[PDB]
Symmetry: D2
């Protein structure tokens, strides 16, 4: 049950957010953001640059000063505030789902039922962590009392992508604020709007000024400013593998700030011959096509055992051909447009590359509409490991199906990747499942499911898919600094 969408949501916030106030760029420059369904400009947005980031970092640093409201505040109260934000986001849930859909392209039903639900669950989960992340009292040798405090890292720079604007914002803000940090956040030029509105609610919820600061703008400018800043303590970045290198380089050439990265992937989805066919087919479709295919953990390498290959493919093509593409605000729409023109063209490039290399086109393969960046759900069969489409992140509605024989074989082929973000195993066999989840070199391994995310369970990549983890108790460690205090005592006893 979903409330009727306002298909033309008004935009209220489009400037830079610092100290709970709205600011034009120092330069007074602005940039257009576009509706990827129509190609029409939604509105102009403040274009943040190095000098704007400087203002934002200075505001955060002051907010973080010892004895400030934010620093003195009860941990439990940081929790109440996160809970209040959740309630405000829920109050304006219909509006935000619509705004997300307008700015990003994903179906309003998914924005509402998935993205918005997950945002509420993430903030609410982390609200609970604010006063429960304990330090230790330590049985150290000698006549001493030793213990640790789990202190905030400090000023945290956070750069989030366009594929899940609201959710990614929440994945970052939850652990950061629960642990008492202050934030300087750069949002994607493609999808700045929803985050800017949330900043208004952050103000409304009662967060002290300077605790959260959002600077819309371009990456080569605003993003690198954060990563290179001499007073930023930590930088978390979710984006492509390409941009990620550009960040850790800039971040290491400054003040030795802490760095975490959530990057691309080429995740294998393995279908053993004893898997439930109907289930494995629907899940493989879901695994790849979700969010217009725009997921780092997309199941973009579908390994199918030879004995069931033909039937699996047969059933998969029918499912991809029945996938409804169109107006994101139509309840019946399964697939919206790609986020922008640059993505649109790049996806079409990979499709054409697939054909040249001898992959077998089974459906789609071309443009799905003359208006907006709609691409047809595309499926490639008989893919081989050495193909570009088998190796590179496409980030589009393009599915690759490979055939294997043995379980030992597929382990080697699934693991032969510079990526290692996620993987899946579909089988009914207890031993096969335990064998594969242990042997697969990925941060998350799903068994008989896919894209199962909980605020409670960590997500992150092995290898070149990134470092560190988000979500769960683990997501706190990156936003925490350990101080050991060791006190001479008259006589230590047990």
């Amino acid at each position: 049950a979903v409330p009727a969408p306002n298909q033309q949501p008004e935009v209220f916030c489009n400037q830079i957010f610092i100290n709970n106030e709205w600011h034009d760029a120092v330069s007074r420059k602005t940039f257009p953001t576009v509706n990827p369904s129509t190609g029409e400009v939604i509105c102009q947005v403040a274009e943040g640059d190095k000098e704007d980031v400087d203002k934002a970092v200075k505001a955060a640093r002051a907010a973080f000063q010892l004895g400030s409201p934010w620093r003195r505040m009860d941990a439990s109260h940081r929790g109440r505030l996160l809970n209040r934000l959740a309630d405000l986001i829920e109050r304006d849930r219909t509006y935000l789902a619509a705004l997300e859909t307008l700015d990003n392209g994903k179906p309003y039903v998914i924005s509402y039922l998935v993205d918005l639900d997950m945002v509420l669950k993430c903030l609410r989960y982390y609200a609970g962590w604010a006063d429960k992340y304990h330090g230790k009292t330590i049985p150290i040798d000698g006549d001493f009392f030793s213990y640790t405090r789990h202190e905030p890292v400090g000023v945290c720079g956070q750069i989030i992508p366009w594929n899940f604007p609201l959710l990614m914002q929440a994945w970052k803000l939850g652990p950061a604020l629960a642990t008492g940090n202050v934030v300087v956040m750069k949002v994607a030029e493609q999808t700045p709007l929803t985050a800017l509105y949330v900043a208004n609610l952050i103000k409304e919820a009662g967060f002290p000024p300077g605790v959260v600061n959002i600077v819309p703008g371009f990456g080569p400018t605003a993003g690198a400013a954060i990563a290179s800043h001499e007073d930023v303590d930590k930088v978390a970045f979710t984006g492509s593998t390409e941009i990620g290198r550009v960040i850790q380089v800039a971040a290491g050439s400054s003040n030795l700030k802490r760095v975490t990265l959530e990057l691309g992937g080429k995740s294998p989805n393995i279908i053993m011959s004893d898997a439930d066919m109907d289930w494995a087919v629907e899940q493989a479709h879901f695994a790849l096509f979700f969010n217009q295919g725009q997921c780092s953990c997309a199941g973009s390498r579908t390994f199918v055992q030879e004995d069931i290959y033909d039937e699996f493919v047969e059933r998969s093509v029918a499912r991809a051909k029945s996938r409804v593409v169109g107006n994101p605000f139509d309840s019946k729409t399964e697939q919206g447009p790609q986020v922008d023109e640059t993505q649109f063209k790049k996806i079409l490039g990979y499709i054409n590359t697939g054909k040249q290399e001898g992959a077998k086109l089974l459906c789609g393969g071309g443009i799905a509409a003359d208006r907006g960046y709609f691409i047809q759900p595309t499926v490639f069969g008989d893919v081989q490991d050495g193909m570009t489409i088998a190796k590179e992140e496409i980030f589009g509605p393009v599915m690759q199906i490979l055939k294997f024989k043995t379980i030992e074989e597929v382990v080697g082929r699934a693991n032969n990747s510079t990526y290692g973000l996620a993987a899946a195993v579909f089988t009914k066999d207890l031993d096969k499942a335990n064998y594969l989840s242990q042997a697969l070199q990925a941060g998350t391994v799903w068994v008989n499911c896919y894209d199962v995310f909980g605020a409670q369970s960590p997500f992150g990549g092995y290898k070149m898919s990134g470092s560190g983890r988000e979500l769960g108790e683990y997501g706190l460690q990156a936003y925490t600094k350990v101080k050991t205090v060791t006190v001479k005592v008259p006589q230590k006893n047990s």
Copy 2:
């Protein structure tokens, strides 16, 4: 490693009461005989501790626990060193202790050596590593305060251990209590005090301060009951029959509100799905029931077998029980030794006669295996029904119950229809069946495609009437730890 040839008649060097690192006679000067179950002959006399010797033990322990004492001041890391030393000393005397364990208890020497001793060693060494790693917390309390917790020793811990695993039970008790800075007054089984008393000697040699560990051999209703009722015992831990754990607890509740943990009986279900690996399932089910002469609280004493494989399984099961070699525990061919004593001997025989009378199908064995010693034939009952006494009551002997079932919903309900809940097992190749069953079974430990798999790392304990609280793992430390909160006014609290 290879099993060294055993001295089949090892000498006894310790048979008295151990208090403050010294050997005592009982006050009454009374001693009692401990028997060799393989021959029925007396091994030696053992000082017979009673309440008055327990009072000496508790006084001793209390003194060693005093603020400023060597034990209380000792670095936690050092308590770990002490535990490793003890382990090193036991490994030195492993051949001797393994043989002594066989002499006093009856279990095959090869098993004492390769199983019991290895597990004792692994248990002590594991907890040696916990000594300096069980942290309290610092806590982000509201207001201008600094709040933290100290995990302090619970104090004077009375520990009563059974006879089925004398060395191992000792280790399971000493490991966590010593790692966390406690002192102990231990009462060992009258059937098997010898090995525990020799280890008391090793505890001295290892360097533990006097009074940290005190051992009082004696009888249950006297020595054991005195620990449970003592006004200066802070914790009592009892492993044994469900029947006696009831008594022990009843005593603790009427004394000083001491902390109590129990490790009691069971009638654990071993569930064989039709898709199980047959040969594997057959050998594991045999092991699951017959191990240690069937003398395990977690014995797989209700063998549920899916109807399609029932006949084959029962046939293979009876073949294996028929081939199981019973005899002298020092002969390497022996898989089964005598039961622990005559009382058990007869109780098991009684249960067998009950099973026959109540209409269970006697498939093999069924009576005495030798004229001398407490040897019983490995016994298998087929067509066992839930309502039968032998399907309900713990037998603690080499008596196997095999029950037929049809569906997975059926077996879960039947397995869970028990006052016990110590352990359970599931043999199947299907992921969903394993997961469905491991979640649904009301048992403290669930084994999947294996049985009797223990590790110092993984907690062990029962649901329902099989006791309360756990042993082993990090959880074993909780029952031996006391939490103190210290909350301090500070000038200005900041994150």
Copy 3:
């Protein structure tokens, strides 16, 4: 600020709460509850007994059945429910605060600012714990995958005292529900009203029927029925130590149910000569007299170093004499009546006992008013360790001041007690504080403060003051069962 109270609040809930339903006793019996300030009957309340307990237990068992809504419910959602309950409670904060004062006698200002706030903070704390109490994956020897599940204990009997009716309810429900248990709760016959109103809010919050059942009645009847019930998996009791020994006895001869107890105390409050005099004096007054002296952790043995003893006693007597006793609804009132005639009489007896013992009566010592159960703030000086008033829990506004010379001396004297619930030290010296915080045999040691409770920090007794802990992560341990699952795997790797 504090809103004006309705001094004659209406009563809505006075029956037995089972399956979200209000029931009369099977016997149709009711009992009168009395207003301690006036000695007048407030209303009649259903008198539950063994048959009513038996119905409650059955309902709880049924709600706890595998596949039930409460068992299948996401842990995070149990969290939502506790937060909703807290919200409904805060909604009715002004009303519940007045009802608490009417039935119990404590000053309304304190019911509102202390009791009700701590109730809210408690439930909101545990809401956070619902989906964060993880089991473990364990590196066991051999080719095995071993892990633990932290399952609920099941049907939990909870018996709560009359001194903090609402807060003790929360201390019990928070952890039990966060961990997925079901509850059969016996409330005190002196103060059943506020707890019954909360049950109404538990139904309104959306808790499934049977998850919380509340049976008002008497101890020898309803209480013993819970403790002795064959189908109750755990019993938690807070109250006098004598009655605690009975509850622990009932559980032993039934079904080996897990029992935790929170019992009495005779907590030492240690004042070193280097302490802040003004703070120490006001804190020692607070520590003994708070809640009409009706706290098990009351600082009922005030040890004062001999060099500041004369001055401390002077200030302490003056403070006691100025303490305003009267209508708990008058904002000027610091001290209401004792909870009932039985307590009233007990306190009078203890006062006389001290007098006959040769303790010096420095002020008070009699009845403070005609109506209700009011007792004059009373102070004894030159108290000795062997005195009955120095050893037994008085649970009234009766202060015991003792003189000591050295720190090594006061440690011994402080510890020479069969109780061990709490302790405090007042000093400015770092080493003195550490020495004493380590040496005192108490579950809680306060330094330069007293009665500082936080939802995050555990509370419970050493020795005969009880077993187990409430509050904090520790509060969850008693409400969880550990299950180990150990699985054979093909080949264990790190």
Copy 4:
């Protein structure tokens, strides 16, 4: 209680350690290691370069392969091996302490009682962690079973310094091997000998070949090759802040490997007017001069309250003048030589800068012997914040004493540093101790003591002092990779 030293220990191991075998450098080149007490060459050592690092890494990768002896080994057994290694090191304790002194210069008595003891305690501490670092079972939403495996990070590059050759090696090997990692370790060109002997003991203990590989050589060559390697999964560096940057840059332009740094410091040692004079003076001397002043956490900024400043400075100078410099093998020697000519000249240069900037040279300040790199214990008084010697890590026997007035003042000046490795407070006051321990921006705060290390308490810096922690349970985090496994189940229940 110290065994007599062999003042000329024989060298048995001087090559590259790969696969438990001793290797010459590919180029066959070698370099001299010097005795800093005599300036004379002890012996030549294999000069490993990029090609050799390449061999070692391949060796490590092979030992880490799924199904290998190290990967299949019981975790408890990894612990048994660490204990065996510790026992072997204890067997050869006299020899190792003598060789440490010979190569490094530290007093033999210190090498024996401090260094080797701490080495033993570190290896034994972590041996105990081997089978106790659990993953989690997670109460995720939905019908799933979700859990984490704590897997090894893989091939770990470890570059260690020359100030604590043996202890540093153990600080790295302990956590790394306890978690099942494999290691390529680069030892200091100045002190490579003891570490290579320890590798012979690693072979003796029974560690599978390729689990530990040691490549002696130079920083710009061997050290850089490790950091830039495309098959190294993690890099841990300890040394100057300068080189730490080089490492973090090289380690970012390669394969996004994990990086932890332990860098320099300029740690504030704060003496309040109510401190114990005798104790504070001896401890401030220890804090600075320990190990020829060669400790990153040295108390190289001694702040003294003006009321006690004069007396503290007088006592400190007297103690510095009394410090015995000489042959490290002489039981009376308190201070040996600096590590090498480079450091020798660098410290004398800092001394020169100190005099040129107008800090009061109170004692020492020159060369202490005609042979070897001995420098007199030096004390500067009236040091100001803006002086080079008050800002830069000197890493030698050069003490700075500063005057302050208020606790608010000293807090601001102590934190006014790009370094935050450690700090200390000497006071008898409870409140002052707590205010400072919280306010000081350092990774370790000592109260009424200094340089108190325990295997159990974590160590590491804030800001430019590095990232991450060593020792304790936290020391395990940088060596662990988290895999989340999420499994579809029939019907989830609590």
